[PDB]
Amino acid sequence: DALKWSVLGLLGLLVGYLVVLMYAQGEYLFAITTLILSSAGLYIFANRKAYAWRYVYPGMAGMGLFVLFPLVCTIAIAFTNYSSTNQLTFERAQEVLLDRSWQAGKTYNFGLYPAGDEWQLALSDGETGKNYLSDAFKFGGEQKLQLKETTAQPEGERANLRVITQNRQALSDITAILPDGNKVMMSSLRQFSGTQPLYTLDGDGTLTNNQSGVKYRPNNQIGFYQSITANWGDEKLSPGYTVTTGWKNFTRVFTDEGIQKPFLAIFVWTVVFSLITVFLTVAVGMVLACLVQWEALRGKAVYRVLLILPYAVPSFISILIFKGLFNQSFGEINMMLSALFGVKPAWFSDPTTARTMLIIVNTWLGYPYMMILCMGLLKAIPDDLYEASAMDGAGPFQNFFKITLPLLIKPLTPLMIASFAFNFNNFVLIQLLTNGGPDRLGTTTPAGYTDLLVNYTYRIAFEGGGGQDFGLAAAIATLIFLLVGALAIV
Amino acid sequence: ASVQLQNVTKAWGEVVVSKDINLDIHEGEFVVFVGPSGCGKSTLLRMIAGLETITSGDLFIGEKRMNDTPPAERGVGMVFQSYALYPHLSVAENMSFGLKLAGAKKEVINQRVNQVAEVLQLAHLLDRKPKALSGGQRQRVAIGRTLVAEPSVFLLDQPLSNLDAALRVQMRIEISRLHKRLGRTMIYVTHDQVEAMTLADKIVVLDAGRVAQVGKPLELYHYPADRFVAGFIGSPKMNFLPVKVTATAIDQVQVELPMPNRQQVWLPVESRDVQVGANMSLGIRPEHLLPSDIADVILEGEVQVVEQLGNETQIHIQIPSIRQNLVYRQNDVVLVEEGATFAIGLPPERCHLFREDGTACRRLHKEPGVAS
Amino acid sequence: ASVQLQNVTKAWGEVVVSKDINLDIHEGEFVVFVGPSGCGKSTLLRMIAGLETITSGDLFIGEKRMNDTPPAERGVGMVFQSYALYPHLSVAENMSFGLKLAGAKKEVINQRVNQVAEVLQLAHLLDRKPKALSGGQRQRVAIGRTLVAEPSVFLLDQPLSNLDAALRVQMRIEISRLHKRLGRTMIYVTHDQVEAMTLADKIVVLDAGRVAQVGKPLELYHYPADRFVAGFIGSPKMNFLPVKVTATAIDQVQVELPMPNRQQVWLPVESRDVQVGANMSLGIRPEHLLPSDIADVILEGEVQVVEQLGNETQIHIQIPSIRQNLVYRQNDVVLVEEGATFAIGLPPERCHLFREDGTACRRLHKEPGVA
Amino acid sequence: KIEEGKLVIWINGDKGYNGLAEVGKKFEKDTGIKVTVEHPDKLEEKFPQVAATGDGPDIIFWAHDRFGGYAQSGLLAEITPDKAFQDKLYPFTWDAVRYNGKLIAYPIAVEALSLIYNKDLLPNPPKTWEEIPALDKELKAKGKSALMFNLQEPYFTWPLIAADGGYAFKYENGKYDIKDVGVDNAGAKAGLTFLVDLIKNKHMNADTDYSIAEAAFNKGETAMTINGPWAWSNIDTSKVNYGVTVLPTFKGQPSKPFVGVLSAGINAASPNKELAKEFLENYLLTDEGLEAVNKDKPLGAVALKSYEEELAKDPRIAATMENAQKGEIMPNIPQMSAFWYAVRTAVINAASGRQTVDEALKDAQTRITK
Amino acid sequence: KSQKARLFITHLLLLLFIAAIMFPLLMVVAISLRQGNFATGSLIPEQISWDHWKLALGFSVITPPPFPVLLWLWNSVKVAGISAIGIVALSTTCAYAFARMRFPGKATLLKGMLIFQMFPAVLSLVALYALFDRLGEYIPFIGLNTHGGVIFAYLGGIALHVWTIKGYFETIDSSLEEAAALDGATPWQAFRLVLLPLSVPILAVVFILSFIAAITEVPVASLLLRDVNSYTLAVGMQQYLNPQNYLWGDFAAAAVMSALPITIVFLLAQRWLVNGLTAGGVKG
Ligand SMILES: Nc1ncnc2c1ncn2[C@@H]1O[C@H](COP(=O)(O)OP(=O)(O)OP(=O)(O)O)[C@@H](O)[C@H]1O
Numbered sequence A: 001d002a003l004k005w006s007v008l009g010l011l012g013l014l015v016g017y018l019v020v021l022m023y024a025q026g027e028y029l030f031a032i033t034t035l036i037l038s039s040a041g042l043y044i045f046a047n048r049k050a051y052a053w054r055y056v057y058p059g060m061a062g063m064g065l066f067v068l069f070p071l072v073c074t075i076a077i078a079f080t081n082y083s084s085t086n087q088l089t090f091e092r093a094q095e096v097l098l099d100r101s102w103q104a105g106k107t108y109n110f111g112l113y114p115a116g117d118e119w120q121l122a123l124s125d126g127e128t129g130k131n132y133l134s135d136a137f138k139f140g141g142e143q144k145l146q147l148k149e150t151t152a153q154p155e156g157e158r159a160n161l162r163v164i165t166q167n168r169q170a171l172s173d174i175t176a177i178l179p180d181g182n183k184v185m186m187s188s189l190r191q192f193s194g195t196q197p198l199y200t201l202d203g204d205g206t207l208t209n210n211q212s213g214v215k216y217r218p219n220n221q222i223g224f225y226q227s228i229t230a231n232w233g234d235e236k237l238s239p240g241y242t243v244t245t246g247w248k249n250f251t252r253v254f255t256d257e258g259i260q261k262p263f264l265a266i267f268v269w270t271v272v273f274s275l276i277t278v279f280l281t282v283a284v285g286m287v288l289a290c291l292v293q294w295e296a297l298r299g300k301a302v303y304r305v306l307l308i309l310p311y312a313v314p315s316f317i318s319i320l321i322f323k324g325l326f327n328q329s330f331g332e333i334n335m336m337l338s339a340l341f342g343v344k345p346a347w348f349s350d351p352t353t354a355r356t357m358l359i360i361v362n363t364w365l366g367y368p369y370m371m372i373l374c375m376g377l378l379k380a381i382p383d384d385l386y387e388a389s390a391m392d393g394a395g396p397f398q399n400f401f402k403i404t405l406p407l408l409i410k411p412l413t414p415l416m417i418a419s420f421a422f423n424f425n426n427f428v429l430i431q432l433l434t435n436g437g438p439d440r441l442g443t444t445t446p447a448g449y450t451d452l453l454v455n456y457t458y459r460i461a462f463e464g465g466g467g468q469d470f471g472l473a474a475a476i477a478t479l480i481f482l483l484v485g486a487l488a489i490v
Numbered sequence B: 001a002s003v004q005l006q007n008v009t010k011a012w013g014e015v016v017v018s019k020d021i022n023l024d025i026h027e028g029e030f031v032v033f034v035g036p037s038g039c040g041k042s043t044l045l046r047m048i049a050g051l052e053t054i055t056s057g058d059l060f061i062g063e064k065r066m067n068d069t070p071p072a073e074r075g076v077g078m079v080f081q082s083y084a085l086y087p088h089l090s091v092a093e094n095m096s097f098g099l100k101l102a103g104a105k106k107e108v109i110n111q112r113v114n115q116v117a118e119v120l121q122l123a124h125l126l127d128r129k130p131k132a133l134s135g136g137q138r139q140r141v142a143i144g145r146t147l148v149a150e151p152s153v154f155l156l157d158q159p160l161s162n163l164d165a166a167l168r169v170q171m172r173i174e175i176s177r178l179h180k181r182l183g184r185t186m187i188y189v190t191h192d193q194v195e196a197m198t199l200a201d202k203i204v205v206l207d208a209g210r211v212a213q214v215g216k217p218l219e220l221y222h223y224p225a226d227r228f229v230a231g232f233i234g235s236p237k238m239n240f241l242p243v244k245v246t247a248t249a250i251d252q253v254q255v256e257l258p259m260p261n262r263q264q265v266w267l268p269v270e271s272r273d274v275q276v277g278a279n280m281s282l283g284i285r286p287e288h289l290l291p292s293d294i295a296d297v298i299l300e301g302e303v304q305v306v307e308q309l310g311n312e313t314q315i316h317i318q319i320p321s322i323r324q325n326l327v328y329r330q331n332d333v334v335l336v337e338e339g340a341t342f343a344i345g346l347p348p349e350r351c352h353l354f355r356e357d358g359t360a361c362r363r364l365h366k367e368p369g370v371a372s
Numbered sequence C: 001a002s003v004q005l006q007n008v009t010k011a012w013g014e015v016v017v018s019k020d021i022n023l024d025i026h027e028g029e030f031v032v033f034v035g036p037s038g039c040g041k042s043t044l045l046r047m048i049a050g051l052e053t054i055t056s057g058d059l060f061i062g063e064k065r066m067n068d069t070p071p072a073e074r075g076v077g078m079v080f081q082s083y084a085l086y087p088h089l090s091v092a093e094n095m096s097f098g099l100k101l102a103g104a105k106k107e108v109i110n111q112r113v114n115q116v117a118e119v120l121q122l123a124h125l126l127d128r129k130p131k132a133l134s135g136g137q138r139q140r141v142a143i144g145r146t147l148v149a150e151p152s153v154f155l156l157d158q159p160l161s162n163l164d165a166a167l168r169v170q171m172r173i174e175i176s177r178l179h180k181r182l183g184r185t186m187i188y189v190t191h192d193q194v195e196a197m198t199l200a201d202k203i204v205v206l207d208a209g210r211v212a213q214v215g216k217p218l219e220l221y222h223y224p225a226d227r228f229v230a231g232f233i234g235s236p237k238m239n240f241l242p243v244k245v246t247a248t249a250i251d252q253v254q255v256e257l258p259m260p261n262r263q264q265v266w267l268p269v270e271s272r273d274v275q276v277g278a279n280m281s282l283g284i285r286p287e288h289l290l291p292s293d294i295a296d297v298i299l300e301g302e303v304q305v306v307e308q309l310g311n312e313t314q315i316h317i318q319i320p321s322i323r324q325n326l327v328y329r330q331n332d333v334v335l336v337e338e339g340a341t342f343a344i345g346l347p348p349e350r351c352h353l354f355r356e357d358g359t360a361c362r363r364l365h366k367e368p369g370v371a
Numbered sequence D: 001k002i003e004e005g006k007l008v009i010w011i012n013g014d015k016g017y018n019g020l021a022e023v024g025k026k027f028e029k030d031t032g033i034k035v036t037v038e039h040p041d042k043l044e045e046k047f048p049q050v051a052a053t054g055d056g057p058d059i060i061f062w063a064h065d066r067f068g069g070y071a072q073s074g075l076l077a078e079i080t081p082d083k084a085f086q087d088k089l090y091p092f093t094w095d096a097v098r099y100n101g102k103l104i105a106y107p108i109a110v111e112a113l114s115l116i117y118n119k120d121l122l123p124n125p126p127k128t129w130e131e132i133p134a135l136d137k138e139l140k141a142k143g144k145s146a147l148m149f150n151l152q153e154p155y156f157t158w159p160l161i162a163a164d165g166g167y168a169f170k171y172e173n174g175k176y177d178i179k180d181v182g183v184d185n186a187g188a189k190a191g192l193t194f195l196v197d198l199i200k201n202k203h204m205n206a207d208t209d210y211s212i213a214e215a216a217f218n219k220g221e222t223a224m225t226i227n228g229p230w231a232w233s234n235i236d237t238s239k240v241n242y243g244v245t246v247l248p249t250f251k252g253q254p255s256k257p258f259v260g261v262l263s264a265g266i267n268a269a270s271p272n273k274e275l276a277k278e279f280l281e282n283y284l285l286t287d288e289g290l291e292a293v294n295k296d297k298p299l300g301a302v303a304l305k306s307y308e309e310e311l312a313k314d315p316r317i318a319a320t321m322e323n324a325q326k327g328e329i330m331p332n333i334p335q336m337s338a339f340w341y342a343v344r345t346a347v348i349n350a351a352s353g354r355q356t357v358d359e360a361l362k363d364a365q366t367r368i369t370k
Numbered sequence E: 001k002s003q004k005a006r007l008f009i010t011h012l013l014l015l016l017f018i019a020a021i022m023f024p025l026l027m028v029v030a031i032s033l034r035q036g037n038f039a040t041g042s043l044i045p046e047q048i049s050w051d052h053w054k055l056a057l058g059f060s061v062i063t064p065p066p067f068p069v070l071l072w073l074w075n076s077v078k079v080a081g082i083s084a085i086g087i088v089a090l091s092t093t094c095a096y097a098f099a100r101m102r103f104p105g106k107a108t109l110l111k112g113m114l115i116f117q118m119f120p121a122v123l124s125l126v127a128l129y130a131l132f133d134r135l136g137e138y139i140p141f142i143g144l145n146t147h148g149g150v151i152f153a154y155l156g157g158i159a160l161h162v163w164t165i166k167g168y169f170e171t172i173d174s175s176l177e178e179a180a181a182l183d184g185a186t187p188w189q190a191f192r193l194v195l196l197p198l199s200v201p202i203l204a205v206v207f208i209l210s211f212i213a214a215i216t217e218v219p220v221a222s223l224l225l226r227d228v229n230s231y232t233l234a235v236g237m238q239q240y241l242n243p244q245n246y247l248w249g250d251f252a253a254a255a256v257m258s259a260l261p262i263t264i265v266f267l268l269a270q271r272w273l274v275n276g277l278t279a280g281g282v283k284g
């Protein structure tokens, strides 16, 4: 080791060999991004001593690449109508439309017959009972061959499926023509027919139907190939393409009396749900973490692992069996509660106790996260501080509220406001137990009592008919992020 | 509370930091612990507190056995050799913590803080968080925390170690005043000899874990139990000379110095169980050494080091055939250059004598300050 | 390795704990800092070390400006008033951390670590981590860490504050032996007056962020520049009596004692800027007070405190018409009861005098050991 | 880019994928063109993503309902099976695979709910829904129950709801009418009124889900349940002497369960449409072809008339075909999204007693429209 | 009331607590040992079958194992293992800069990092598939259908951890690094040799949290991995889920198996979770 200018030169080589290579073959976004990241990358390790940035940058690269990018992308799509309908790009939609086949002639069931070193095509009319043979021909490129109404069989055995498949390329380029006059192309591995393109695109850009004579032009205000008549044109064609929509579907959220109806009420629930999740999760987490390092508490190593297992097993399966346990008439939770106690709680039917069902499950689901966090975080407090506590006459409850707790809230604050945001949009937990069940009653748009902001949104974007509207969904995700963002700063 | 320790032993597996120590600290006494750095003063102190376990033996604090008692319930407060200040709390909050836990009432709490912060001179640092203080300022905050609490027993681990000469005296007076006002049992660790002598009713000298000697300040100074106690107490160290027991009498032991001076000297010494011809050690303090023209027993040598302290001059003297230099203390500034010829008188009345094993032969010479 | 400070000022916003201080530490000098708890000794060191930024002024090491230089590139080593020991590492690994980090010469590393550990009585504790050591042991580890590095500039912040008398002396000798062996610049913070008097080529007295006075050990003892320095150097504090000026000469000042007798005494002292009838402060050290039988000027009072120290007895006498008690030092054990009437001698040629601004009236009496 | 000289096939995990690869090898041995059959997780969601770029498999196997969406997005190529080929399959299966009048996929398997009964507990199953209360009465005394199925999910409750005149969306001739929804009408109201009555008289439990219902039948706690072909393997492991028969009738009309036809659709981006249609028509949809996949994992009822008659030798497959025949083709339109949530909630509210049968379905229709 | 009265009522209050939280998990075990595929039944299975665990492992109940579930597991430990290390390294180094180094716009970046990670995880896979499709053609082994790509995708989730480890850093006394600086350490040497070994417990926290996050990760891993043999357990078990029924026994056996590497990693990390690492060292 002596000089890094040998390394930065060699790395200055690849950045260019890859960059200019990305500039070609039409990958400009990936050419621009790879330049700036390598520019900021090489700059910090070189002449200008940005020593502090040498530690931040490799972290911000991955975070920029895999977190920041997915955001800029999802806000970008929020300004467009990208959805089930309007899924394809314009070129893709046009490509699909120019591929649309239309059968005008008759199917003929072809055969391939070897004639020495050459081949011979045969066609049999399903109706009329007519049979046709062509002259001897060789494969390769576009060619028309005249068919004659034969009455006898061709010499040489019919070719296998293998042979007609191996020659499918050349066989598709031959356009057979009958003794009467009509053209017939290959439509399948077994048949020749008068299948023709349904559309042909003019140099102007205007599509035109080859069967009905109806003309079509792109309508980039809606993202469809609209009909035209000498402007519109009351007929649109599927697929449909993605096109810039602007502040639309952002404004649509602030308009609909019905979509906006139960918004304020579910918002109250989302705040509360995540708040008292964060509280209980931290409370249970911290207390358990303290008890675990009590060093007088024997077997703590076994306690330690067992309290963690609700996190060791994937959420999906756990939430689902919780749905089984909390069953209002069946389920083991109400078996014991009718056995020792009198009341048999209605965990699904009644809203307020359903809200309770969700908080205890999430507490079970999330407490090991906080206690793992606290387990190490607690080690930051030096032992002699508790020795000072003892000499002032304190502990263990006095110790907790005067030393340990108020010496963790500061490092723990960012972790629980982030946990507030996580549980603000804890989609998975809700849908698996209750789709917001029970019903809100009177809501013109699918809304229930247990529904978060995200669950209600998901159903009004993806469900509720009208296909899966990704554009709308992306717009709402931006709004609630801005809502929770402005909320979390305060 | 009358804290006492019976055959208390502490072991770190193999490392024996304390060896069946016996101490009986009476209610209201002021006892100071002294010993070399690394002997186990903090260990003994922390074992009393309950911040360290007791491997063997019994610890009593009052009418209770405290071995298996959590420290908080022992009714003790300790000011640490570190400081262990609460970093998240201000000076005011640090000091008002013991009684903020035990008792109540804002007004009583604040009035007692300002009063104690006054004497420690922390009154202007009341809103300061600990990391914004000075080393010595923190030390006083740790004192404040214990003094404001007023526990049954006061434990103090080197509480003046990082304070200026003048402030050390002021605090020493303030500690002394609290002891007579409260009458609370106080155990005090210090390396400062002045603090040890002037504060204690009783001093405990510790040696490699084991207790070397227990007694009143002047009792230990004049009459040490062995060579160790003699060497450990005294501003500069007591001088030690190799001697030969030439003769033994009823109350006096004759010894001779191993140089060309050839002077035999009888010493008012225990005389019981002394071997003639056996190599013993003669102990004389630099403060006791007289100027040469005064005394009869003369020791001449070469000056090695001259330390000018202002109030006094300390002179190191290499005696012709001796292994270690002889320190001598004389009042005021004395002009002596290095390598000069110097002589001092050796007074037999103020001489200590130690056997082969180290144990001292009792000085029969009646000294002021000590009764019987 | 010379270190100098030019109008160096340190402020924590509003709190100024170092106001334009000026110090001139030459190569190979042993300079010790003394000052009250809180004065800003550690700060000075930390600024020199580059762990604290200079708010205003210039700092030079060698002869180069060092204000913007990182701590690593200053040739400065520091044994912290804390200890700043690496808790995750052993005594050996603490003492060997410096040189094994760049210039890792294992033959030399293990040789001098063992060497320095030997003189600090740490040979047996070599495997221990800080938490398995004593507060005094950790102190010697902190010194050892710096002694193994052997930097161009030595900063020592109160490095003997937690050691027994006999060991404190042993370490004092070990510092003094090393200084003369290497001839390096050492800045040494201590509260122990003995340490200051015995180690220093030069002593710096600090007061509330200001340099009060700089000079030789005996220089500051015999001739303090003001009330503060006089009251700060000397085992127990110098005694301070209020006096009234009666007459003035070029060479001397005649003052009147505040008690009934109104004794008038001539003091070999400055007289510069001293008016008759102006209230001065008479300074006399406990060590200099004479037995009654010798001295001409006699002060009689009442014994309040007697402190036995083995080697000497300290008697506190409340003399009428003085608010402060007079502390007196006498050789050997003296038996005096609290309340007994005691008389001492007040030697004129050993008296200090201070104006109302507290500035010392320069003593014109020559005292041995001051050039 | 989809590759040239090959066919990539997507199928679900619960289908005989190893058997389909055996049909592919038989195809290759004849064609030279290799067939890769993959079974990825959530292929129904993966396909719209990969296909939109012009990729994914050449041919995808999934239920017809999801295919109306793919067609609308322009992901599926229009298929052209000849008149002679269409007659090989049951004519109603063709109604499932046509978006915009044009055919978009090849029907493979037919799937629908049937009455599963314990032979030991009930040798003769009822033909009618009206005689269930009478049957439960005589079974409750022996500590058992007559019928127990999933009441939570509208898919299971629909047979009885749709029997009297309920329907998702009215089918004109080749296209559904999104305006015309039959959840708020006499037929649907009468179905749900009877369902609630079965709960009122304590014959069925309001919050019985799939797993609670299935466990009871396998243990022999309930005499009969209503489930699909997938559940048969579980009852086979229980060794319960069971029978699969036609769903009971309500108000003289047969139960109309939703019909799920497994469909084979070709990618519109595929350059091998001709290679695929040959493989599907002449290799898979033959007795030998369907046998290879069925011998791997049972398909149940199939659309191929020929092989269906062979499978219907086992009465279970005959029953599920019969119920599907009388059943209702699950609409392939995206408006089914609204249907699933609204009817779920409607049945939930009526079984819970939160809403009356009339207003529970009226709101459910208003949920679907506008 | 007293000292030992606290101790044993904690054992009871904790045994009761663990019993309550373990019960749902024992049900998962129960359904993996139950014959056939039933989500609900008796606590001790009505009819016990090993077939699910026989198929989870290499064994054949006529009839051979359908899926390489042990390879699911090994791919899971592979991906989640070196993913966590990567997450640790990137978030550890990044925190040291935010905690010990002053640079323009540090507080606004940390504000950003957190908020920029508080975005709804929807429409994200659309972007991720496009990126790794672009990556694969230039740098393979980190593109589509490869572990490298899957682990690289998880490296974006450091923001949460950076804040965390930064917070722990600042608890360490400022003096230990100053002592290092005066011993001549480069910011890197102070970071590696002094700070890290004292920050070790919070490093184990981050490691285990990330290790579990990746073990239980489905959407991205399922979106990236094609080859059956390359599946992680979290993806490989998603085959057991069908629109009409789940293969609960095989699914629960996989669900339990996934907890094993977590438990092993959690147990090993205890070596690093130790009090009084900083004891001694700094006086105060
Ligand atoms: N954890 C431990 N393991 C092994 N030995 C220890 C441990 N802690 C302390 N020691 C040893 O025991 C002795 C403890 O001394 P302690 O700190 O109790 O008081 P001290 O040494 O008198 O204080 P000082 O050194 O400040 O005068 C030291 O010699 C030390 O080497």
Ligand SMILES: Nc1ncnc2c1ncn2[C@@H]1O[C@H](COP(=O)(O)OP(=O)(O)OP(=O)(O)O)[C@@H](O)[C@H]1O
Pocket: B131, B132, B133, B134, B135, B136, B137, B162, C012, C015, C017, C035, C036, C037, C038, C039, C040, C041, C042, C043, C044, C081
């Ligand atoms: N961060 C800070 N903010 C405000 N004031 C401070 C801060 N740090 C120190 N001080 C004040 O400035 C002074 C600094 O003194 P420093 O600790 O540097 O040496 P010292 O006080 O002479 O040492 P000691 O008192 O331990 O002998 C202290 O009196 C303290 O009150």
Ligand SMILES: OC[C@H]1O[C@H](O[C@H]2[C@H](O)[C@@H](O)[C@@H](O)O[C@@H]2CO)[C@H](O)[C@@H](O)[C@@H]1O
Pocket: A277, A281, A315, A362, A363, A365, A366, A367, A369, A418, A419, A420, A422, A423, A426, A429, E213
């Ligand atoms: O709050 C309940 C919630 O806790 C856990 O979620 C964690 C997540 O796993 C971490 O990666 C990080 O993002 O913090 C979250 C806490 O807000 C559980 O994973 C989850 O199942 C549970 O619902």
